[PDB]
């Protein structure tokens, strides 16, 4: 089951994502991102992302529909 869950977690970060700019984070599991669409969104971040890669000018890919930053 855990392997299946990780397979899905890989699946959620597949190709069609949209690019955005990572503003300052909020909590362990959420952050603020500025989308290339122009608007900004309050977005929960996937745990698998290494937080140390996250910087207030980092280029970050958002979920196409849910805007979830993975």
């Amino acid at each position: 089951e855990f392997l299946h869950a990780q397979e899905e977690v890989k699946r959620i970060q597949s190709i069609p994502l949209v690019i955005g700019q990572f503003l300052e984070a909020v909590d362990q599991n959420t952050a603020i991102v500025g989308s290339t669409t122009g608007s900004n969104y309050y977005v929960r971040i996937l745990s698998t992302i290494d937080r140390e890669l996250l910087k207030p000018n980092a280029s970050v890919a958002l979920h196409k529909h849910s805007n979830a930053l993975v």
């Binding site: 899905e8 699946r11 959620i12 597949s14 290494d50 937080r51 140390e52 529909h65």
Partner: protein, 279 residues
């Protein structure tokens, strides 16, 4: 004689027809009828689905061509499909499953044509990546809601075990239409038939990847190992027993050694088997 939590059954072939037709007509909404059986008060089994042509009127009762559906049913009956129209579906690309006002009017028309026919909404671009987004609707008669009654007689824990998606109720869920639980009546035969699409063929099972690419992947993963080992020394040096803050070396090194090990064993073992077998 209001119906309870209930259940709706769609065959696997019906679901594949649904998704194929939904994805084909994107970004325009497409709509077709469902062919099935009403069985009893507690279940609705749609068994097969046929699409119907697009029209400039958009998805509406004006879109359903009575001659087309009539000739279609007359033809299917001669081939093994005598079931009546138990409902209709329409695609909603770009937004979640819910009925708009025109959708409500169409469902009212079908309800007039029936007693408990259902409406199905599929989002063909959100239903992707293995996640499927299908919802089944039926209008709540205003009279019943006008006189302060619950939508259905809740009898068993069935029903409420599912939760309404927040997106729908803004559009009117539990106000004018209620969501009936979706279920898939696949048998073992269709399942084993469907499994052939990803099923491993024997030569493909004995395929030996690529030694050069395997070595290159090994080198990359080993580079990750070296970096993670440096960070592991860094993390073991912070053992001064401070406040409790997996990241950096530990988890990455663990999964990396797992994947490198399993790849190496599978490759070497398969090579040994081929050496033994073919000659």
């Amino acid at each position: 004689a209001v119906d309870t939590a209930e259940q709706v059954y769609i065959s696997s072939l019906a679901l594949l027809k649904m998704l194929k037709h939904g994805r084909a007509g994107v970004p325009m909404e497409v709509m077709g009828l469902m062919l099935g059986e009403f069985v009893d008060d507690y279940t609705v089994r749609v068994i097969d689905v046929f699409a119907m042509p697009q029209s400039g009127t958009g998805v509406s009762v004006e879109a359903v061509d009575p001659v087309f559906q009539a000739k279609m049913l007359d033809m299917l009956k001669q081939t093994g499909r005598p079931e009546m129209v138990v409902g209709w579906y329409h695609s909603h690309p770009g937004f979640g499953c819910w009925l708009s006002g025109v959708d409500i009017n169409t469902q009212q028309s079908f309800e007039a044509l029936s007693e408990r026919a259902v409406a199905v909404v599929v989002d063909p671009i959100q239903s992707v990546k293995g996640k499927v987004v299908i919802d089944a609707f039926r209008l709540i008669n205003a009279n019943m809601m006008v006189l302060g009654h619950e939508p259905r007689q809740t009898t068993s824990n069935l029903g409420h075990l599912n939760k309404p998606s927040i997106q729908a109720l803004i559009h009117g869920l539990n106000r004018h239409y209620y969501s009936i639980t979706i279920n898939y009546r696949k048998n073992e035969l269709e399942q084993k038939m469907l499994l052939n699409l990803h099923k491993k063929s024997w030569m493909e099972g004995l395929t030996l990847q690529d030694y050069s690419e395997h070595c290159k992947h090994n080198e990359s993963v080993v580079k990750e190992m070296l970096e993670l080992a440096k960070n592991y020394n860094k993390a073991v040096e912070e053992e001064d027993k401070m406040t409790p803050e997996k990241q950096d070396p530990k988890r990455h090194l663990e999964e990396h050694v797992d994947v490198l090990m399993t790849s190496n064993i599978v490759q070497c073992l398969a090579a040994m088997l081929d050496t033994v077998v073919f000659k």
